[PDB]
Amino acid sequence: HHNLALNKTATASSIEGAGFEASRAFDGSSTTRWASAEGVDPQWIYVNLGSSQTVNRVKLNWEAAYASSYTIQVSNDSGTPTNWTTVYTTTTGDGGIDDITFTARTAKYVRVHGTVRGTPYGYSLWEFEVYG
Numbered sequence: 001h002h003n004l005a006l007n008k009t010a011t012a013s014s015i016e017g018a019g020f021e022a023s024r025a026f027d028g029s030s031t032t033r034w035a036s037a038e039g040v041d042p043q044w045i046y047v048n049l050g051s052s053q054t055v056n057r058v059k060l061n062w063e064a065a066y067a068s069s070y071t072i073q074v075s076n077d078s079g080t081p082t083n084w085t086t087v088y089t090t091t092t093g094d095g096g097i098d099d100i101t102f103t104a105r106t107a108k109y110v111r112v113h114g115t116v117r118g119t120p121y122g123y124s125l126w127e128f129e130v131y132g
Contacts (some may be wrong), residue, residue: 004029004055004111005047005130008125013031013037014123026123033063036122044094045124046111047130052076055132058088059097060112063124066095067114081109091116103131 010022012034020035022045036043049055058072069091073084087102095118108131114123 001131003129004049004053004086004132005128007028008050009048010034010045013043014040014122015019019045020124025128028036028127030061030126033124033126034062035065035124038122039120040122042102042113042115044113045123045128046075046081046109046127048109049107049130051105053132054104054106055079055107055110055130057099057101058110058112059072059099059127059129059130059131061126061128062095063099063126064095064119065121066093066118067112067116067123068093068118069116070114072100072102073111073113074105075111076105076107076111078108081111083112094118
């Protein structure tokens with residue numbers, strides 16, 4: 001299906017270093033990843049879809065450094081987003097592929113906001129896809 005987030009501009013709370021930029025979660029490749037700084041909660045990444053779009057599904061392909069507690073959230077702010085609406089919450093994530101369908105919302109930005117890690121590293125996504 002049509003990934004509204006592919007090669008759109010992304011912003012993350014931190015990155016581990018060059019090569020693990022936020023943008024690497026939006027390139028279509030499962031051999032490139034965003035990775036956060038390590039050893040510190042929370043972390044987050046959001047994508048700017050470029051305009052207000054209908055959104056109803058997020059598909060996360062986590063790397064091994066996954067979030068076991070995270071939320072998916074949306075914002076229809078026009079400027080730099082600080083108003084987030086949570087559409088999904090878990091404390092039992094186990095990484096791999098999370099394919100999360102929610103009641104459709106109108107959104108310009110979609111955020112993954114992680115608070116507990118499944119590893120002692122950071123948070124890391126091969127790909128973060130959005131549909132709607």
